[PDB]
Design a binder for this molecule. Structure first.
Ligand SMILES: Nc1nc2c(ncn2[C@@H]2O[C@H](COP(=O)(O)OP(=O)(O)OP(=O)(O)O)[C@@H](O)[C@H]2O)c(=O)[nH]1
Ligand SMILES: Nc1ncnc2c1ncn2[C@@H]1O[C@H](COP(=O)(O)OP(=O)(O)CP(=O)(O)O)[C@@H](O)[C@H]1O
Ligand SMILES: Nc1nc2c(ncn2[C@@H]2O[C@H](COP(=O)(O)OP(=O)(O)O)[C@@H](O)[C@H]2O)c(=O)[nH]1
Ligand SMILES: Cc1nc(N(C)c2ccc3c(ccn3C)c2)c2sccc2n1
Ligand SMILES: [Ca+2]
Ligand SMILES: [Mg+2]
Ligand SMILES: [Mg+2]
Lengths: 54, 334, 427, 437
């Protein structure tokens, strides 16, 4: 029914049409997680290399 | 070699369809959760339509229509009938109903209850059956869930001998193409205790459910009168046929109800396909006028007609999508 | 992403030498090492297995290993013998006498440092090294025992690279000595811990295929290795050739191995063909698919109907309708879905490569991580126990410093593996 | 005028960026060397196409764009492709070992070692912006780099540009063109870690692009190339309002204010018609009513699902070609009476509309025919949640046995991050259920 906010220009046009009305982590915490998984990666590789030394 | 899965064990109907599908040696049954299936006899609640139609190289078909609950739940059916232009308030075959929520259209319901008391015409209603507003609204709030308040049909057609009340169940099958098939065998679930017009407390001669009646078995086996005998009766007692007095209106209501929701539930250009069996519950009054009581979405059959219906479901709803290597249905054309 | 290839022992060197024969011809390299081919598809990833020298020479990134010179002499005087970098031949003189002990602990320990030196020289030329493929048998001494010793040392210096093996399993049907079930059980124990991907090339299966299917009355090791080089060419195509997937040794491990110990693969191949006998009729795509999934085409002697596939990798080579390939692959999974686990959705992946192998217009190679593979390890465990319960032939190993306790462990670890596999067959 | 920096991550992102930036050049008349005969203002200008291109005194127009992959194979083809002269090197960032289909390896292990260099290279484009709006981030859900590195980058962009907007063009996994069995894990992982850092995500389900390519374009086995030209038109439709004169969706903040009321539910469904085969000999051109009707057929949706069984929160119709407002409203009024369009109670039933009179540009020699009018509908339907159902179910099957989890934990990730991510998606699915039923 109701057509509103019609803006025309050389390139096209735009409008709305209404049919009915209604009824963050910090840089510190990010470097912490990234390095905390680097520790688990190191720990596991060192258990491996230890086993391989046995 | 087509594959399928069963997800509703308690389905008497589709228990019998799986046994028929296996018995052709062209349908293998898979486990509940195997997704590589051609056909799904799914559950009744939370059926996962979001997961159908996404198995490449598989054509997937299920035995329910997503959205058909709007027709098969008493609150929804009322609302559907009252807001849809195609059915309307002037709908001449649905009893006057209102939706009532426990402590909504509770003020609107009373507004009709006064005309009916201020006209001294009949004023029985149902949810328990009573002729006074106040014992009803007290009953709804004492249960918990949402109820529907409906005009009780105070002048039903009464079978003779016995002065007995009944209701007609029609089985309708809708295929993936949205052909509307009516099973030629209906059933009258009858009352065995003669209908009593003054005492609405005795709910054994007013409610005709096969469970409540189980004088059961007096007139006809299991309180179930089929169409041949009900037609013979109307011919003899009333000088008219089942077809002209009742069936024509039943074919009209079925068609109207299903035509109304076809745009909302059809699977014509969908990535999975749907078929569904319905139970339509009709009430005939003493002027040979048919009324819609409710639509059931998970209906069971009558023990004689299982073999013939279930075999038709395979023929027209399943083999038509997955063919293998005169008709018991009336197609309600549109 | 370079791959470093190692071949240890008699078997290891013979099948290895046939792999390089085969995939050279496929990429257009001649024995000399010069390119003489017509499609650019051939050179686009040839860096994965070959180095480049000046004069546009391609030299395989292969290291040749043995404890007795006999077989590596054969290779040098073989068809493609001159294409291998002569500095990469690393051999002793003693031999290992079909003794795992000698390969892992005494004879082998002597030589293993030379080998790792050459491994490092090749690794340093690598722009980004993805890991290692080793070819070896498990029933002899060198490939079995010093190969698994190489693996343990290669893992220590390169713990973050992929270790992939082609491991020939032993069978009484094609047997050198009675200690083979001892050597292989000691080796499976190593492979379970220290590889990511092992293709189980079972000699039982290879013998049955020559005898039954190909109608060869008395098969040779040559007849066995034809099937093996065909399979090796196949399972590596999606590393060697440009395509829609473009995989590598780590991507294959991630998608194939749901749990790190269950990393033992059944290769399959279609159409099976014998040496020299040319076949004039190409197969239809439904024919490849029915064949590659049949037991009579598996290179591990296991009944795939006695278990379930955890994952599957399929490869079709040749000019064919990729649409039809897709429908056939889907058909098999839909027709026999009880044989694919339902807790790993979409566990079959197919790839295509236009270039076919020599002498076929179209072929299908199959990589199955089935739980039926336990039939293989169980067979070996019976053969091990029938000797071990009487400590029979053990002196050959205790003589080199080994203790019975090492056998009991390997046996237990391989029985665990078989149970682990059985666990997921009833999931 | 306010610029937009485009970031393409992983294989799907880079290959789709090649598709779009090629189109973008054909649309704006920019030859494969950066030369635009039209930009009379040599070297500068606050025009509508300068939101995606900067100029150089040399006369070259160069995309406000950065390509990033943990492997050199794909980006190397941008380096030597027909559009190489477009991009300068600083913009093309290649690592050495890709993530091997492994989120935890793109996010933690190999991520950590290139994130700083990428952020620096983005700060070099932000620095030539008089008024940066934010970012368009193209990536797959399923890849190792696409899922894992993208979510790291997204977290860092919120701390280095906390005021700026971030949009996503995300490829949703489908088995017909999959590369990995762990794509369900990588999806739920990257969706969880990105959800709070993304303002609007256009999800494009590869299943849907593949079937559209099969049914309407008559390609029998679509490749990435087939898929990416169809996807680039959709992308172009969405971004045209930022590269051309108009009053609808003129900045990135307007995408959130027009398509996303609730922040968490920010995945608008995109629908697109007509897709007509180039080598279809006789074709009768489709009217405004016909193409607008097809916006409501699931067979034309970027994600297969049924909007009749959900509710709309917003809805935009982007036309391109011979469209006038009169014929749009006509088509709407017939459609509203034939189709199920339920809005949520707390939102006006309506359609913001944009028309660009230039008909969709088509890649010369491609698979798509020229047409006289095309529309892309952007609706925020709760129905898209089916896509999360599908994905969460597949994730649930594998995780119930911890299958493949060791490949993640081996890389430093913790088994609990899997269940943290899955509980989030369990939340999201429920948010959709409250809003929609
Ligand atoms: N539509 C489309 N999808 C693609 C394209 N390339 C890859 N994909 C999809 O992306 C997913 C795989 O993710 P990729 O982008 O290839 O992975 P990646 O981000 O490069 O990470 P890697 O694992 O390092 O290669 C699969 O779901 C593919 O279907 C493409 O060019 N177009
Ligand atoms: N408005 C009405 N007028 C007269 N009788 C009515 C009535 N509504 C219901 N009845 C009677 O009461 C019974 C109960 O109706 P209803 O259809 O709600 O039972 P039900 O819920 O078990 C059937 P369904 O299988 O569809 O759920 C009917 O079988 C009919 O005999
Ligand atoms: N399939 C195959 N098996 C082989 C070959 N050579 C040896 N074998 C098997 O390898 C085992 C013996 O190992 P071998 O390689 O000779 O010992 P090694 O030199 O000490 O490692 C036995 O099971 C043989 O059947 C071969 O060329 N092909
Ligand atoms: C070297 C190699 N790698 C492959 N990848 C990495 C793979 C495997 C198995 C896969 C996928 C995706 C799902 N599943 C089950 C990918 C494939 S897939 C076909 C041949 C092939 N060859
Ligand atoms: Ca300018
Ligand atoms: Mg020997
Ligand atoms: Mg990649």
């Amino acid at each position: 029914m109701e057509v509103i906010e019609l803006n025309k220009c050389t390139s096209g046009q735009s409008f709305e049409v209404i049919l009915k009305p209604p009824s963050d982590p910090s840089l510190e915490e990010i470097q912490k997680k990234l390095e905390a998984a680097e520790e688990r990666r190191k720990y596991q590789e060192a258990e491996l290399l230890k086993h391989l030394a046995e | 070699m087509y594959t399928f899965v069963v997800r509703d064990e308690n389905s008497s109907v589709y228990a019998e369809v799986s046994r028929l599908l296996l018995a052709t040696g062209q349908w293998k049954r898979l486990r509940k959760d195997n997704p590589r299936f051609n056909l799904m006899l799914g559950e009744r609640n939370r059926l996962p339509f979001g997961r159908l139609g996404h198995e490449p190289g598989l054509v997937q078909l299920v035995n329910y229509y997503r959205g058909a609950d709007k027709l098969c739940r008493k609150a929804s059916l009322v609302k559907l009938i009252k807001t849809s232009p195609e059915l309307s308030e002037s709908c001449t075959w649905f009893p006057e109903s209102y939706v009532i929520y426990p402590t909504d259209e509770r003020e609107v319901f009373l507004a009709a209850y006064n005309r009916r008391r201020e006209g001294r015409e009949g004023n029985v209603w149902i949810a328990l059956i009573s002729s006074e507003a106040s014992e009803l609204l007290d009953f709804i709030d004492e249960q918990g869930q949402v109820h529907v308040i409906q005009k009780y049909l105070e002048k039903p057609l009464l079978l003779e001998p016995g002065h007995r009340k009944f209701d007609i169940r029609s089985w309708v099958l809708v295929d993936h193409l949205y052909n509307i098939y009516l099973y030629r065998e209906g059933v009258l679930r009858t009352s065995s205790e003669p209908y009593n017009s003054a005492n609405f407390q005795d709910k054994t001669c007013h409610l005709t459910n096969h469970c409540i009646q189980k004088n059961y078995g007096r007139y006809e086996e299991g309180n179930e009168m089929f169409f041949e005998e009900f037609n013979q009766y109307l011919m003899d007692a009333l000088n008219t046929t089942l077809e002209n007095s009742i069936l024509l209106q039943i074919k009209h209501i079925i068609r109207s109800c299903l035509m109304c929701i076809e745009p909302a539930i059809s699977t014509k250009h969908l990535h999975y396909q749907s078929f569904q069996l319905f139970g339509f519950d009709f009430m005939v009054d003493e002027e040979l006028k048919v009324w819609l009581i409710e639509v059931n979405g998970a209906p069971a059959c009558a023990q004689k007609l299982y073999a013939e219906l279930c075999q038709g479901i395979v023929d027209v709803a399943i083999s038509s999508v997955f063919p293998l290597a005169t008709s018991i249905f009336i197609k309600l054309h549109h | 992403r370079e791959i470093v290839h190692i071949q240890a022992g008699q078997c290891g060197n013979q099948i290895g030498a046939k792999f390089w024969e085969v995939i050279s011809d496929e990429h257009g390299i001649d024995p000399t090492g010069s390119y003489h081919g017509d499609s650019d598809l051939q050179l686009e990833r040839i860096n994965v297995y070959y180095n480049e020298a000046t004069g546009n020479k391609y030299v395989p990134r292969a290291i040749l290993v043995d404890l007795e010179p006999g077989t590596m002499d054969s290779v040098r005087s073989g068809p493609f013998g001159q294409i291998f970098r002569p500095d990469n031949f690393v051999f002793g003189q003693s031999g290992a006498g079909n003794n795992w002990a000698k390969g892992h602990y005494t004879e082998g320990a002597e030589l293993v440092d030379s080998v790792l030196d050459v491994v490092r020289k090749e690794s340093e030329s690598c722009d980004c090294l993805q890991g290692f493929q080793l070819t070896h048998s498990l029933g002899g001494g060198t490939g079995s025992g010093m190969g698994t010793l190489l693996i343990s040392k290669i893992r220590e210096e390169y713990p973050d690279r992929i270790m992939n093996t082609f491991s020939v399993m032993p069978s009484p049907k094609v047997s050198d000595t009675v200690v083979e079930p001892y050597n292989a059980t000691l080796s499976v124990h190593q492979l379970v811990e220290n590889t990511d991907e092992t293709y189980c090339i079972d000699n039982e299966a290879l013998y049955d295929i020559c005898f039954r299917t190909l109608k060869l009355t008395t098969p040779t090791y040559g007849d066995l290795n034809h099937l093996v080089s065909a399979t090796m060419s196949g399972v590596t195509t999606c590393l060697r050739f440009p395509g829609q997937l473009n995989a590598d040794l780590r991507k294959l491990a991630v998608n194939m191995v749901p749990f790190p110990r269950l990393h033992f693969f059944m290769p399959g191949f279609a159409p099976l063909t014998s040496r020299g006998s040319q076949q004039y009729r190409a197969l239809t795509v439904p024919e490849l698919t029915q064949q590659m999934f049949d037991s009579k085409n598996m290179m591990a002697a296991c009944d795939p109907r006695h278990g379930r596939y955890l994952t599957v990798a399929a490869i079709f080579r040749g000019r064919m309708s990729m649409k039809e390939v897709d429908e056939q692959m889907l058909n098999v999974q839909n027709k026999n879905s009880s044989y694919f686990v339902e807790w790993i959705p979409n566990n079959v992946k197919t790839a295509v490569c236009d270039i076919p192998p020599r002498g076929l217009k179209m072929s299908a190679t199959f990589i199955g991580n089935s739980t039926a593979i336990q039939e293989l390890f169980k067979r070996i465990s019976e053969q091990f126990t029938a000797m071990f319960r009487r400590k029979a032939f053990l002196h050959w190993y205790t003589g080199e410093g080994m203790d019975e306790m090492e056998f009991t462990e390997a046996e237990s670890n391989m029985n665990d593996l078989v149970s682990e596999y059985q666990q997921y067959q009833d999931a | 005028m306010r610029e937009c920096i485009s970031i393409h991550v992983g294989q799907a992102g880079v290959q789709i960026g090649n598709a779009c930036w090629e189109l973008y050049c054909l649309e704006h008349g920019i030859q494969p060397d950066g030369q635009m005969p039209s930009d009379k203002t040599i070297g500068g200008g606050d025009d509508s196409f300068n939101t995606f291109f900067s100029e150089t005194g040399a006369g070259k127009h160069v995309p406000r764009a950065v390509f990033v992959d943990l492997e050199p194979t794909v980006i190397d083809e941008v380096r030597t492709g027909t559009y190489r002269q477009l991009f300068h090197p600083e913009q093309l960032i290649t690592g050495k070992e890709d993530a091997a289909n492994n989120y935890a390896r793109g996010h933690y292990t190999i991520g950590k070692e290139i994130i700083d260099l990428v952020l620096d290279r983005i700060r070099k484009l932000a620095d030539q912006c008089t008024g940066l709006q934010g970012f368009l981030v193209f990536h797959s859900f399923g890849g190792g780099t696409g899922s894992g590195f993208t979510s790291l980058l997204m977290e860092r962009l919120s701390v280095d540009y906390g005021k700026k907007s971030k949009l996503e063009f995300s490829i949703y996994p489908a088995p017909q063109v999959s590369t990995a069995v762990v794509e369900p894990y990588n999806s739920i992982l990257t969706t969880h870690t990105t959800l709070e850092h993304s303002d609007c995500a256009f999800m494009v389900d590869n299943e849907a692009i593949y079937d559209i390519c099969r049914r309407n374009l008559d390609i029998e086995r679509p490749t990435y190339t087939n898929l990416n030209r169809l996807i680039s038109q959709i992308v172009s439709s969405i971004t045209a309002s930022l590269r051309f004169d108009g009053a609808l969706n003129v900045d990135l903040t307007e995408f959130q204010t027009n398509l996303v009321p609730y922040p968490r539910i920010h995945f608008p469904l995109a629908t697109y018609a007509p897709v007509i085969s180039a080598e279809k000999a006789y074709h009768e051109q489709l009217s405004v009513a016909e193409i607008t009707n097809a916006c409501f057929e699931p067979a034309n949706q970027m994600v297969k699902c049924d909007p009749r069984h959900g509710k709309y929160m917003a809805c935009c119709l982007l036309y391109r070609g011979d469209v006038v407002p009169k014929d749009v409203n006509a088509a709407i009024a017939t459609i509203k009476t034939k189709r199920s369009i339920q809005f949520v109670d707390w939102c006006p039933t309506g359609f913001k509309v944009g028309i660009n009179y230039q008909p969709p540009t088509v890649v010369p020699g491609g698979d798509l025919a020229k047409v006289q009018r095309a529309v892309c509908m952007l609706s925020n339907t709760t129905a898209i949640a089916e896509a999360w159902a599908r994905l969460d179910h597949k994730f649930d099957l594998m995780y119930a046995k911890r299958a493949f989890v060791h490949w993640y934990v081996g890389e430093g990730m913790e088994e609990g991050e899997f269940s943290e991510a899955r509980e989030d998606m369990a939340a999201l699915e429920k948010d959709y259920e409250e809003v929609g039923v």
